[PDB]
Coordinates of all heavy atoms in Angstrom, one line a residue:
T1 N -106.4 7.8 15.2 CA -106.5 8.4 16.5 C -107.1 9.8 16.4 O -108.0 10.2 17.2 CB -105.2 8.4 17.3 OG1 -104.6 7.1 17.2 CG2 -105.4 8.8 18.8
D2 N -106.7 10.6 15.5 CA -107.1 12.0 15.2 C -108.3 12.0 14.3 O -108.9 13.1 14.1 CB -106.0 12.8 14.6 CG -104.8 12.7 15.5 OD1 -104.1 11.7 15.5 OD2 -104.4 13.8 16.1
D3 N -108.7 10.9 13.6 CA -109.8 10.8 12.7 C -109.7 11.8 11.5 O -110.6 12.5 11.1 CB -111.2 11.1 13.5 CG -111.5 10.0 14.4 OD1 -111.1 8.9 14.2 OD2 -112.2 10.3 15.4
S4 N -108.5 11.7 10.9 CA -108.1 12.5 9.8 C -107.3 11.7 8.8 O -106.6 10.8 9.2 CB -107.2 13.7 10.3 OG -107.1 14.6 9.2
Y5 N -107.4 12.1 7.5 CA -106.7 11.4 6.5 C -106.1 12.4 5.5 O -106.7 13.4 5.2 CB -107.6 10.4 5.8 CG -108.4 9.5 6.7 CD1 -109.7 9.9 7.2 CD2 -107.9 8.3 7.1 CE1 -110.3 9.2 8.1 CE2 -108.6 7.5 8.0 CZ -109.8 7.9 8.5 OH -110.5 7.2 9.4
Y6 N -104.9 12.1 4.9 CA -104.3 12.9 3.9 C -103.4 12.1 3.1 O -102.9 11.0 3.4 CB -103.5 14.1 4.5 CG -104.1 14.9 5.6 CD1 -103.9 14.6 7.0 CD2 -104.8 16.0 5.3 CE1 -104.5 15.4 7.9 CE2 -105.4 16.8 6.2 CZ -105.2 16.5 7.6 OH -105.8 17.3 8.5
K7 N -103.1 12.7 1.9 CA -102.1 12.1 0.9 C -100.9 12.9 1.0 O -100.9 14.2 0.9 CB -102.7 12.3 -0.5 CG -103.7 11.2 -0.9 CD -104.1 11.2 -2.3 CE -105.0 12.5 -2.6 NZ -105.6 12.5 -4.0
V8 N -99.7 12.2 1.3 CA -98.5 12.9 1.7 C -97.3 12.5 0.8 O -97.4 11.4 0.2 CB -98.2 12.6 3.2 CG1 -99.4 13.0 4.1 CG2 -97.8 11.2 3.4
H9 N -96.3 13.3 0.9 CA -95.0 13.0 0.2 C -93.9 13.4 1.1 O -94.1 14.2 2.0 CB -94.9 13.8 -1.2 CG -93.7 13.4 -1.9 ND1 -93.5 12.2 -2.5 CD2 -92.6 14.1 -2.2 CE1 -92.4 12.1 -3.1 NE2 -91.8 13.3 -3.0
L10 N -92.8 12.7 1.0 CA -91.6 12.9 1.8 C -91.2 14.4 1.8 O -91.2 15.0 0.7 CB -90.5 12.0 1.4 CG -90.6 10.6 1.8 CD1 -89.5 9.7 1.1 CD2 -90.7 10.3 3.3
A11 N -91.0 15.0 3.0 CA -90.6 16.4 3.0 C -89.2 16.6 2.5 O -88.5 15.6 2.2 CB -90.7 16.9 4.5
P12 N -88.7 17.8 2.4 CA -87.3 18.1 2.1 C -86.4 17.7 3.3 O -85.3 17.2 3.1 CB -87.2 19.6 1.8 CG -88.6 19.9 1.3 CD -89.5 19.1 2.1
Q13 N -86.9 17.8 4.5 CA -86.0 17.4 5.7 C -85.9 15.9 5.7 O -84.8 15.4 5.9 CB -86.6 17.8 7.0 CG -86.6 19.4 7.3 CD -87.5 20.2 6.4 OE1 -88.2 19.6 5.5 NE2 -87.5 21.5 6.6
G14 N -86.9 15.1 5.4 CA -86.8 13.7 5.2 C -86.6 12.9 6.5 O -86.6 13.5 7.6
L15 N -86.4 11.6 6.4 CA -86.4 10.8 7.5 C -85.1 11.0 8.3 O -84.1 11.4 7.8 CB -86.4 9.3 7.1 CG -86.4 8.3 8.3 CD1 -87.6 8.5 9.2 CD2 -86.5 6.9 7.7
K16 N -85.2 10.9 9.6 CA -84.1 11.1 10.6 C -84.2 10.1 11.7 O -85.1 10.1 12.5 CB -84.1 12.5 11.1 CG -82.9 12.8 12.0 CD -82.9 14.3 12.4 CE -81.8 14.6 13.4 NZ -82.1 14.0 14.8
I17 N -83.2 9.2 11.8 CA -83.2 8.1 12.8 C -82.0 8.4 13.7 O -80.9 8.9 13.3 CB -83.0 6.7 12.1 CG1 -84.1 6.4 11.1 CG2 -82.9 5.6 13.2 CD1 -85.5 6.8 11.5
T18 N -82.2 8.2 15.0 CA -81.2 8.4 16.0 C -81.4 7.5 17.2 O -82.5 7.3 17.7 CB -81.1 9.9 16.5 OG1 -80.4 10.0 17.7 CG2 -82.6 10.4 16.7
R19 N -80.3 7.0 17.8 CA -80.2 6.2 19.0 C -79.3 6.8 20.0 O -78.2 7.3 19.6 CB -79.7 4.8 18.6 CG -79.8 3.7 19.6 CD -79.9 2.3 19.0 NE -78.6 1.7 18.4 CZ -78.3 1.6 17.1 NH1 -79.0 2.2 16.2 NH2 -77.3 0.9 16.8
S20 N -79.7 6.7 21.3 CA -79.0 7.6 22.3 C -78.7 6.7 23.6 O -79.4 5.7 23.8 CB -79.9 8.8 22.7 OG -79.3 9.6 23.6
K21 N -77.7 7.2 24.3 CA -77.2 6.7 25.6 C -78.3 6.2 26.5 O -78.2 5.0 26.9 CB -76.4 7.9 26.3 CG -75.7 7.4 27.6 CD -75.2 8.6 28.3 CE -74.2 8.2 29.4 NZ -73.4 9.4 29.9
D22 N -79.2 7.0 26.8 CA -80.3 6.7 27.7 C -81.5 5.9 27.0 O -82.6 6.1 27.4 CB -80.8 7.9 28.4 CG -79.8 8.6 29.3 OD1 -79.1 8.0 30.0 OD2 -79.9 9.9 29.4
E23 N -81.2 5.3 25.9 CA -82.1 4.4 25.3 C -81.3 3.2 24.6 O -81.5 3.0 23.4 CB -82.9 5.1 24.2 CG -83.8 6.3 24.8 CD -84.5 7.0 23.7 OE1 -83.9 7.2 22.6 OE2 -85.6 7.5 23.9
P24 N -80.5 2.5 25.4 CA -79.7 1.5 24.8 C -80.3 0.4 23.9 O -79.7 0.0 22.9 CB -79.0 0.8 26.0 CG -79.1 1.8 27.1 CD -80.4 2.4 26.9
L25 N -81.6 0.1 24.2 CA -82.3 -1.0 23.4 C -83.2 -0.4 22.4 O -83.6 -1.2 21.5 CB -83.0 -1.9 24.4 CG -82.3 -2.3 25.7 CD1 -83.2 -3.3 26.5 CD2 -81.0 -3.0 25.3
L26 N -83.6 0.9 22.4 CA -84.7 1.4 21.6 C -84.1 2.0 20.3 O -82.9 2.1 20.1 CB -85.5 2.4 22.4 CG -85.8 2.2 23.9 CD1 -86.7 3.2 24.5 CD2 -86.5 0.8 23.9
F27 N -85.0 2.5 19.5 CA -84.7 3.2 18.2 C -85.8 4.3 18.0 O -87.0 3.9 17.9 CB -84.7 2.3 17.1 CG -83.7 1.2 17.1 CD1 -84.0 0.0 17.7 CD2 -82.5 1.4 16.6 CE1 -83.1 -1.0 17.8 CE2 -81.6 0.4 16.7 CZ -81.9 -0.9 17.2
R28 N -85.4 5.5 17.8 CA -86.2 6.7 17.6 C -86.2 7.1 16.2 O -85.1 7.1 15.6 CB -85.8 7.8 18.6 CG -86.4 9.2 18.2 CD -86.4 10.2 19.4 NE -87.5 10.1 20.3 CZ -87.5 9.4 21.4 NH1 -86.5 8.7 21.8 NH2 -88.7 9.3 22.1
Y29 N -87.3 7.6 15.7 CA -87.4 8.0 14.3 C -88.1 9.4 14.3 O -88.9 9.7 15.2 CB -88.2 7.0 13.5 CG -89.5 6.4 14.0 CD1 -90.7 7.2 13.8 CD2 -89.5 5.4 14.9 CE1 -91.9 6.8 14.4 CE2 -90.7 5.0 15.5 CZ -91.9 5.7 15.2 OH -93.1 5.3 15.8
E30 N -87.8 10.2 13.3 CA -88.3 11.6 13.2 C -88.5 11.8 11.7 O -87.6 11.7 10.9 CB -87.4 12.6 13.7 CG -87.1 12.6 15.2 CD -86.1 13.7 15.7 OE1 -86.0 14.7 14.9 OE2 -85.4 13.5 16.7
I31 N -89.8 12.0 11.3 CA -90.2 12.1 9.9 C -91.0 13.4 9.7 O -91.8 13.8 10.6 CB -90.9 10.9 9.4 CG1 -91.1 10.9 7.9 CG2 -92.3 10.8 10.2 CD1 -91.8 9.6 7.4
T32 N -90.8 14.1 8.6 CA -91.6 15.2 8.2 C -92.2 15.0 6.9 O -91.6 14.3 6.0 CB -90.7 16.4 8.1 OG1 -90.0 16.6 9.4 CG2 -91.5 17.7 7.8
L33 N -93.4 15.5 6.7 CA -94.2 15.2 5.5 C -94.9 16.5 5.0 O -95.1 17.4 5.8 CB -95.3 14.1 5.8 CG -94.8 12.7 6.3 CD1 -95.9 11.8 6.8 CD2 -93.9 12.1 5.2
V34 N -95.3 16.4 3.8 CA -96.0 17.5 3.1 C -97.3 17.0 2.5 O -97.2 15.9 1.8 CB -95.2 18.3 2.1 CG1 -94.2 19.2 2.7 CG2 -94.4 17.3 1.2
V35 N -98.4 17.6 2.7 CA -99.7 17.0 2.4 C -100.0 17.4 0.9 O -100.1 18.6 0.6 CB -100.8 17.6 3.3 CG1 -102.2 17.4 2.7 CG2 -100.7 16.8 4.6
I36 N -100.2 16.4 0.1 CA -100.6 16.7 -1.3 C -102.0 17.2 -1.3 O -102.4 18.1 -2.1 CB -100.4 15.4 -2.2 CG1 -98.9 15.1 -2.3 CG2 -101.1 15.7 -3.6 CD1 -98.7 13.6 -2.7
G37 N -102.9 16.6 -0.5 CA -104.3 16.9 -0.5 C -105.1 15.9 0.3 O -104.6 14.9 0.8
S38 N -106.4 16.2 0.4 CA -107.3 15.3 1.1 C -107.4 14.0 0.4 O -107.5 13.9 -0.9 CB -108.7 16.0 1.2 OG -109.5 15.3 2.1
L39 N -107.5 12.9 1.1 CA -107.5 11.6 0.6 C -108.9 11.3 0.0 O -109.0 10.4 -0.8 CB -107.2 10.6 1.7 CG -107.0 9.1 1.3 CD1 -105.9 8.9 0.3 CD2 -106.7 8.4 2.6
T40 N -110.0 12.0 0.5 CA -111.3 11.7 0.0 C -111.5 12.1 -1.5 O -112.2 11.5 -2.2 CB -112.3 12.4 0.8 OG1 -112.2 13.8 0.7 CG2 -112.2 12.0 2.3

């Protein structure tokens, strides 16, 4: 969508999943990444 590419590794914060009252059926995810460098 952004027309951009990178090589990434899991951040120190790492994956974070949470489910909430006003989303009984859904599942939300929060991820942070650190860019090793350009994929090209």
